[PDB]
């Protein structure tokens, strides 16, 4: 029961950590997309200048 | 100026449409690599049993 | 005996997920600084325009 109880807690940590990792991964993709759009504006603004 | 601006917009669309297609295909490729690591561990564990 | 190995595997998975999650935080900080720097560069280029 000690290892079984501790195993359930360890498994729950993976699920809890996976939830935060999913949001972090999605935020990284969203932030990366904004960097691409910002880079295009810099090149377009610099080219227009 | 209108032709250059219109032609320049075509290159901008290619940098986003083509990039999105490569990013979508690249995302699926990375998923297969992670699945290969999990499958490799199952082979060592299944072979031991 | 076999259950002990499963508990260690679950605990090790938390470290692997935590390591990958911790790495995402470092990349998120870089994107935040790059986004802030890109905004300043765009403002300077736009202001100079």
Swiss-Prot record, chains A, C:
Residues modified to Phosphoserine: 36
Segments crossing the lipid bilayer: none
Summary of the tissues where the protein is detected: In the kidney, expressed in the glomeruli. Also expressed in leukocytes.
Post-translational modification: ISGylated. Ubiquitination.
Subcellular location field: Cytoplasm, Cytoskeleton; Cytoplasm, Cell cortex; Cytoplasmic vesicle, Secretory vesicle, Cortical granule; Cell membrane
The record's note on its domains: The rodlike tail sequence is highly repetitive, showing cycles of a 28-residue repeat pattern composed of 4 heptapeptides, characteristic for alpha-helical coiled coils.
Disorder association: Macrothrombocytopenia and granulocyte inclusions with or without nephritis or sensorineural hearing loss: An autosomal dominant disorder characterized by thrombocytopenia, giant platelets and Dohle body-like inclusions in peripheral blood leukocytes with variable ultrastructural appearance. Some affected individuals lack leukocyte inclusion bodies on classic staining of peripheral blood smears. Alport syndrome-like features of nephritis, hearing loss, and eye abnormalities are present in some patients. Deafness, autosomal dominant, 17: A form of deafness characterized by progressive high frequency hearing impairment and cochleosaccular degeneration.
Quaternary structure and interacting proteins, as annotated: Myosin is a hexameric protein that consists of 2 heavy chain subunits (MHC), 2 alkali light chain subunits (MLC) and 2 regulatory light chain subunits (MLC-2). Interacts with RASIP1. Interacts with DDR1. Interacts with PDLIM2. Interacts with SVIL. Interacts with HTRA3. Interacts with Myo7a. Interacts with CFAP95. Interacts with LIMCH1; independently of the integration of MYH9 into the myosin complex. Interacts with RAB3A. Interacts with ZBED4. Interacts with S100A4; this interaction increases cell motility.
Family of this protein: Belongs to the TRAFAC class myosin-kinesin ATPase superfamily. Myosin family.
Described purpose of this protein according to its UniProt entry: Cellular myosin that appears to play a role in cytokinesis, cell shape, and specialized functions such as secretion and capping. Required for cortical actin clearance prior to oocyte exocytosis. Promotes cell motility in conjunction with S100A4. During cell spreading, plays an important role in cytoskeleton reorganization, focal contact formation (in the margins but not the central part of spreading cells), and lamellipodial retraction; this function is mechanically antagonized by MYH10. (Microbial infection) Acts as a receptor for herpes simplex virus 1/HHV-1 envelope glycoprotein B.
Protein's name in the database: Myosin-9
Native species: Homo sapiens
Gene designation: MYH9
């Amino acid at each position: 029961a000690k290892k079984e109880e501790e195993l359930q807690a360890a498994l729950a940590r993976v699920e809890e950590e996976a939830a935060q990792k999913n949001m972090a991964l999605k935020k990284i993709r969203e932030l990366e997309s904004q960097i691409s759009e910002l880079q295009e504006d810099l090149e377009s603004e610099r080219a227009s200048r | 100026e209108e032709e250059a601006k219109t032609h320049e917009a075509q290159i901008q669309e290619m940098r986003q449409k083509h990039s999105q297609a490569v990013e979508e295909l690249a995302e699926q490729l990375e998923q297969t690599k992670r699945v290969k690591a999990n499958l490799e561990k199952a082979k060592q564990t299944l072979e031991n049993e």
